[PDB]
Amino acid sequence: TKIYRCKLTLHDNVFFASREMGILYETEKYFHNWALSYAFFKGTIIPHPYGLVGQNAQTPAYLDRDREQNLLHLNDSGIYVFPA
């Protein structure tokens, strides 16, 4: 129902390790939706555990109801960010 046109201005340099070739690591020119969804709603809606240990420390929880860092909380909040 509501739609928000949000324009993002970088106030310091942004890095994502999108691809790697030798000494060079580089960032794709589109911000992925799921990265922005946690940037907007983690701590406010999605939980933000400061620590991890175990399999949970190197396995995503993107769409796993059994884990706290889900993007599915937002399906239930009725919210969806698009990619940038």
* # residues near RNA by CB under 7 A: 23
Binding span for RNA by CB under 7 A among 3-11, 13-21, 73-81 = 13-21
> CA 46 from chain center: how many Å?
11
**Sequence-ordered alpha helix ranges (H) in 1-84:** 33-41, 73-77
Nearer to RNA, 1 or 43 (CB): 43
Pairwise CA distance, residues 28 & 84, whole Å: 11
* Of residues 16-75, those binding RNA (CB under 7 A): 16-18, 27-28, 30-32, 34-35, 38-39, 42, 52, 56-62, 69
- H/E segment holding residue 61: none
| Under rule CB under 7 A, residue 79 binds RNA | no
Give the nearest distance from C-beta 76 to RNA in angstroms.
17
> What tokens were used for 2?
């509501």
